[PDB]
Enzyme design. Structure first.
Site, PDB file in Angstrom:
ATOM      1  N   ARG A  91      -3.779  11.369  -3.449  1.00  0.00           N
ATOM      2  CA  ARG A  91      -2.630  10.684  -4.037  1.00  0.00           C
ATOM      3  C   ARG A  91      -2.380  11.141  -5.471  1.00  0.00           C
ATOM      4  O   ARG A  91      -1.223  11.279  -5.884  1.00  0.00           O
ATOM      5  CB  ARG A  91      -2.783   9.165  -3.947  1.00  0.00           C
ATOM      6  CG  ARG A  91      -1.434   8.469  -4.024  1.00  0.00           C
ATOM      7  CD  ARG A  91      -1.515   6.954  -3.873  1.00  0.00           C
ATOM      8  NE  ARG A  91      -0.177   6.455  -3.564  1.00  0.00           N
ATOM      9  CZ  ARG A  91       0.099   5.485  -2.698  1.00  0.00           C
ATOM     10  NH1 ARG A  91      -0.878   4.846  -2.064  1.00  0.00           N
ATOM     11  NH2 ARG A  91       1.363   5.164  -2.479  1.00  0.00           N
ATOM     12  N   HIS A 104       3.540   3.249   1.148  1.00  0.00           N
ATOM     13  CA  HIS A 104       3.278   1.961   0.522  1.00  0.00           C
ATOM     14  C   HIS A 104       2.229   2.157  -0.571  1.00  0.00           C
ATOM     15  O   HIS A 104       1.461   3.123  -0.553  1.00  0.00           O
ATOM     16  CB  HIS A 104       2.765   0.982   1.584  1.00  0.00           C
ATOM     17  CG  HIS A 104       2.631  -0.429   1.099  1.00  0.00           C
ATOM     18  ND1 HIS A 104       1.455  -0.923   0.576  1.00  0.00           N
ATOM     19  CD2 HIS A 104       3.523  -1.445   1.048  1.00  0.00           C
ATOM     20  CE1 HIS A 104       1.627  -2.185   0.224  1.00  0.00           C
ATOM     21  NE2 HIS A 104       2.874  -2.529   0.505  1.00  0.00           N
ATOM     22  N   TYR A 105       2.198   1.234  -1.544  1.00  0.00           N
ATOM     23  CA  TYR A 105       1.290   1.430  -2.672  1.00  0.00           C
ATOM     24  C   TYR A 105      -0.176   1.319  -2.282  1.00  0.00           C
ATOM     25  O   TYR A 105      -1.039   1.779  -3.041  1.00  0.00           O
ATOM     26  CB  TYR A 105       1.603   0.473  -3.830  1.00  0.00           C
ATOM     27  CG  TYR A 105       1.227  -0.981  -3.636  1.00  0.00           C
ATOM     28  CD1 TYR A 105      -0.064  -1.447  -3.913  1.00  0.00           C
ATOM     29  CD2 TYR A 105       2.173  -1.899  -3.225  1.00  0.00           C
ATOM     30  CE1 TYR A 105      -0.388  -2.798  -3.758  1.00  0.00           C
ATOM     31  CE2 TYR A 105       1.863  -3.241  -3.074  1.00  0.00           C
ATOM     32  CZ  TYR A 105       0.584  -3.683  -3.330  1.00  0.00           C
ATOM     33  OH  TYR A 105       0.306  -5.028  -3.164  1.00  0.00           O
ATOM     34  N   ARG A 106      -0.477   0.740  -1.126  1.00  0.00           N
ATOM     35  CA  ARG A 106      -1.871   0.554  -0.754  1.00  0.00           C
ATOM     36  C   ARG A 106      -2.490   1.832  -0.193  1.00  0.00           C
ATOM     37  O   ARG A 106      -1.813   2.832   0.084  1.00  0.00           O
ATOM     38  CB  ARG A 106      -2.021  -0.606   0.224  1.00  0.00           C
ATOM     39  CG  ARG A 106      -1.928  -1.935  -0.487  1.00  0.00           C
ATOM     40  CD  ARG A 106      -2.149  -3.116   0.418  1.00  0.00           C
ATOM     41  NE  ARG A 106      -2.103  -4.353  -0.361  1.00  0.00           N
ATOM     42  CZ  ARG A 106      -1.560  -5.488   0.057  1.00  0.00           C
ATOM     43  NH1 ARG A 106      -1.014  -5.549   1.274  1.00  0.00           N
ATOM     44  NH2 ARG A 106      -1.555  -6.560  -0.730  1.00  0.00           N
ATOM     45  N   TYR A 107      -3.812   1.768  -0.019  1.00  0.00           N
ATOM     46  CA  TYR A 107      -4.646   2.888   0.389  1.00  0.00           C
ATOM     47  C   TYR A 107      -5.512   2.426   1.550  1.00  0.00           C
ATOM     48  O   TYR A 107      -6.127   1.358   1.478  1.00  0.00           O
ATOM     49  CB  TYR A 107      -5.621   3.276  -0.723  1.00  0.00           C
ATOM     50  CG  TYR A 107      -5.079   3.738  -2.063  1.00  0.00           C
ATOM     51  CD1 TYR A 107      -4.444   2.869  -2.943  1.00  0.00           C
ATOM     52  CD2 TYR A 107      -5.303   5.043  -2.486  1.00  0.00           C
ATOM     53  CE1 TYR A 107      -4.001   3.302  -4.188  1.00  0.00           C
ATOM     54  CE2 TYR A 107      -4.869   5.484  -3.724  1.00  0.00           C
ATOM     55  CZ  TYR A 107      -4.228   4.615  -4.571  1.00  0.00           C
ATOM     56  OH  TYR A 107      -3.810   5.076  -5.803  1.00  0.00           O
TER      57      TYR A 107
END
Ligand code: NA
EC number: 3.1.-.-
Length: 181
Positions: free
Chosen positions: A113, A128-131
């Protein structure tokens, strides 16, 4: 077809080194799974051209790894830039997952990222901002029941598509071996 806001985008990059400010992306591969980890589609597997001045930043580990795998030769012969690789990848992803819905999925995926933010922000924005970091589960399993990890192994070839396939296989293994859902 199986387009769904629940589908997961898996990505693996190869780079000329560990520092996004100094190094460059030389390979990208994507895979889309459904929410149950079934592989729906594999995306473009792209060796990204870089000039010798950028390949010349590679240390011994990177040089030997990416030469032995054949990636360096593919990079030198490639006619695909980062912008073109983004275009190809977005055109694939739009057929399978809506924008902004899937976390970024892989192993230690925060590193990829960082390279996306720096070199491919248009593609980073698709996630999306999550991982979803499979290595989070690896590390918790090592601490909670390390004997489990002896039942799974990886080849680790640093060919981006093969490595992301191993990431998916690792999570599938954890689903059965360490989860109860
Ligand atoms: Na990786």
């Amino acid at each position: 077809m199986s387009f769904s806001d629940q589908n997961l985008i898996w990505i693996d990059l190869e780079m000329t080194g560990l520092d996004p400010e100094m190094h460059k992306i030389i390979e990208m591969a994507t895979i889309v799974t459904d929410s149950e980890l079934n592989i729906l589609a594999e995306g473009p597997v792209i060796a990204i051209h870089q000039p010798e001045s950028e390949l010349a930043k590679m240390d011994e580990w990177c040089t030997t790894t990416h030469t032995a795998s054949g990636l360096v030769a593919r990079v030198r012969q490639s006619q695909v830039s980062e912008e073109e690789a983004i275009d190809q990848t977005l055109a694939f992803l739009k057929q399978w997952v809506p924008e902004g819905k899937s976390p970024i999925c892989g192993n230690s995926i925060g590193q990829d990222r960082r390279f996306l933010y720096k070199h491919m922000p248009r593609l980073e924005a698709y996630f999306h901002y999550r991982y979803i970091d499979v290595s989070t589960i690896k590390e918790l399993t090592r601490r909670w029941q390390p004997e489990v990890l002896k039942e799974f192994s990886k080849t680790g070839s640093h060919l981006a598509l093969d490595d992301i396939r191993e990431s998916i296989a690792e999570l599938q293994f954890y689903r059965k071996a360490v989860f109860k859902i």
